Structure 1
């Protein structure tokens, strides 16, 4: 089997991407944030505290003839950005882009933190990291990909995120029309439960490439590119008037600037992030200070190749017995 779904930016900045997911019988379609940096599929629901729901579509398990309470199971998650959610668990039929899993754990939120409530466009998360990170207790549950894997034509999914445009998530096949040149594959460590890999270095604009190992994770659920402070300083030094602002919480730059590109290495290959991809717009409405898309990972404890980097590539998440990542230009 295969599946193929379109993923759409939630706003004009590509702050996140949502993908429609069918849950239950008859189908209830919710728009979920596909997150290769976590392993829970959780949804706003009929059980979510009413004051914490503001415009999201909810899953109502009592309206699904295939929903079953997973008795005794609870979940609770805290993300890198300080947001959180928790609740109880159902199993139900979940379909993505025509690919169906029966008996998927659907984690129903009883509580969500304010950042979830305030984002009316995201109805929940679909985690695509390794199932060792899943938070369901006392019986840990499998991701949608891990449940689908054995049925797929190939044990892979691909992320093809758009810049200010829709893109695609495919399951079980590699669309050879969706990228240019060849896919370069690179080793993955699953020791922290992430799609963790080592970039071979970077360049800023038309500058020389610096060969240096940068360990980090491929994370579709993180908006920005978080790298070591040395690398980030080297990038922003090429932008007149850019500075790190403790009050704003990262590097800002004059909205009048033209940003340089950023290149990262994948083995002997190179992925080029155009400068425009690194502009996240005014820090507040009407400001002439703009927020940068490349930020320091200092204090986060890991480097994160989030959407700013991934949207410059066609990315293969290879779930074979020994997982690997693939990157192609597009």
Structure 2
């Protein structure tokens, strides 16, 4: 089997991407944030505290003839941006782009933090990291990909995120028309439950490539590119007027600037992030100070190849017995 679904930016800045997901019988379609940095599929639901729902579409298990309460199971998750959610668990039928899993754990939110409430466009998350990170207790549950894997034509999914445009998540096949050149594959460590890999270095603009190992995660659920402070300082030093602002919470730059590209290494291959991808717009409405898309990972504890990086590539998440990651230009 295979699946193919379009993923769409939630706003003009590509702050996140939503993908429609069918849950239950008859289908209830929710727009979920596919997140390769976490491993829970959770949804706004009929059980979510009413004051914490503001425009989202909810899953109502009682209206699904295939929903079954997973007795005794609870979940609770906190994300890197400080947001959180928790609740109980059902199993139900879940389909993405024509690919159907029966008996998928659908985590129903009883509580969500303010950032989720305030984002009306995201109805939940669909985790695509390794199932060892799944938070369901006392019986850990498998991700959608893990459940689908054996049925897929090939045990892979691909992320093809757009810049200010829709893109695609595919399951079970590699669309050879979706990228240019070749796919370069690189080793993955699953030791922390992530799609963790080591970039071979970077360049800023038309500058020389610096060969240096950068361990980090491929994370579709993170907006920006978070890299070591040395790398980030080297980038922003090429933008007149750019500075790190403690009050804003990162590097900002004059909105009048033309940003240089940023290149990262995948083995001997190179992925180029155009300068425009690094512009996240005014820090507040009307400001001439703009927020940067490359930020320091210092104090996160991990480097994160988020959407800013991933959207410059066609990315293969290879879930073979020894997982690997593949990157191609497009």
* TM-score greater than 0.5 by the shorter chain: yes
The offset of 1:89, in angstroms, is 0.0
CA distance in 1, matches of 2:192, 2:151: 26
Give the structure 1 partner of residue 38 of structure 2: 38
Alpha-carbon displacement from aligned partner over 1:154-184 (angstroms, at most 9, x marks no partner): 0000000000000000000000000000000
The offset of 1:141, in angstroms, is 0.0
Normalising by structure 2, we get a TM-score of 1.00
The offset of 1:307, in angstroms, is 0.1
CA distance in 2, matches of 1:293, 1:222: 11
CA distance in 2, matches of 1:91, 1:276: 42
Give the structure 1 partner of residue 181 of structure 2: 181
CA distance in 1, matches of 2:291, 2:110: 34
Give the structure 2 partner of residue 247 of structure 1: 247
Three-state SS of the structure 2 residue aligned to 1:233 is helix
CA distance in 1, matches of 2:324, 2:34: 19
Alpha-carbon displacement from aligned partner over 1:53-84 (angstroms, at most 9, x marks no partner): 00000000000000000000000000000000
Alpha-carbon displacement from aligned partner over 1:291-326 (angstroms, at most 9, x marks no partner): 000000000000000000000000000000000000
CA distance in 1, matches of 2:274, 2:65: 48
Three-state SS of the structure 2 residue aligned to 1:15 is coil
Alpha-carbon displacement from aligned partner over 1:180-206 (angstroms, at most 9, x marks no partner): 000000000000000000000000000
Three-state SS of the structure 1 residue aligned to 2:203 is strand
The offset of 1:142, in angstroms, is 0.0
CA distance in 2, matches of 1:198, 1:41: 27
Alpha-carbon displacement from aligned partner over 1:103-122 (angstroms, at most 9, x marks no partner): 00000000000000000000
Three-state SS of the structure 2 residue aligned to 1:234 is helix
The offset of 1:244, in angstroms, is 0.1
Alpha-carbon displacement from aligned partner over 1:240-273 (angstroms, at most 9, x marks no partner): 0000000000000000000000000000000000
CA distance in 2, matches of 1:59, 1:323: 32
The offset of 1:283, in angstroms, is 0.1
Three-state SS of the structure 2 residue aligned to 1:192 is coil
Three-state SS of the structure 1 residue aligned to 2:145 is helix
Alpha-carbon displacement from aligned partner over 1:110-161 (angstroms, at most 9, x marks no partner): 0000000000000000000000000000000000000000000000000000
CA distance in 1, matches of 2:284, 2:203: 30
Give the structure 1 partner of residue 281 of structure 2: 281
Number of residue pairs matched by the alignment? 330
The offset of 1:328, in angstroms, is 0.1
The offset of 1:101, in angstroms, is 0.0
Give the structure 2 partner of residue 74 of structure 1: 74
Do structure 1's residue 125 and structure 2's residue 120 form an aligned pair?
Answer: no
| Structure 1 residue ranges, 4+ long, deviating more than 3 angstroms after superposition | none
The offset of 1:6, in angstroms, is 0.0
Three-state SS of the structure 2 residue aligned to 1:132 is helix
Three-state SS of the structure 2 residue aligned to 1:221 is coil
Three-state SS of the structure 2 residue aligned to 1:149 is helix
Give the structure 1 partner of residue 197 of structure 2: 197
CA distance in 2, matches of 1:78, 1:316: 26
CA distance in 1, matches of 2:280, 2:193: 29
CA distance in 1, matches of 2:78, 2:175: 34
Three-state SS of the structure 1 residue aligned to 2:208 is coil
CA distance in 2, matches of 1:323, 1:260: 33
The offset of 1:223, in angstroms, is 0.1
Alpha-carbon displacement from aligned partner over 1:75-103 (angstroms, at most 9, x marks no partner): 00000000000000000000000000000
Normalising by structure 1, we get a TM-score of 1.00
CA distance in 2, matches of 1:8, 1:78: 24
